[PDB]
Amino acid sequence: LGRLTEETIDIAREVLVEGKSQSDVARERGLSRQRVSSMVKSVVSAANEIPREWQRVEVWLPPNLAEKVRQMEADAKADVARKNQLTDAALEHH
């Protein structure tokens, strides 16, 4: 929900609100399966405020190491935030 074409928002909205399968929607608009699935993916990663190359992982493990993995995530997410505001300033003269 930011800077995206109008078509990307209209396709994507019909599967995540009022739940319909991806296959059916291909035939009605006349698009490949590969491309309807690349449209849904860039709206999900924009609602999370993270780049598009990051991946999703899920495992079982003991309780001490289960805490160290929760912390890797939280610190890495606030580091993109700081480093992004700095390069916006550098392009406003000064």
Which residues are near a copy of itself by CB under 8 A? 48, 50, 53-63, 65-66, 69-70, 72-73, 76
Q: How far is the CB of 40 from a copy of itself (least distance, A)?
A: 16
| Comparison of 21 and 55: residue with beta carbon closer to a copy of itself | 55
d(CA 82, CA 94): 19
Distance of closest approach, residue 31 Cβ to a copy of itself, in angstroms: 27
Q: CA distances (Å), 21 to each of 24, 31, 56, 73, in order?
A: 6, 14, 22, 31
Other residues' Cβ atoms within 10 Å of the Cβ of residue 11: 20
We find the least distance from the C-beta atom of residue 81 to a copy of itself, in angstroms, to be 15
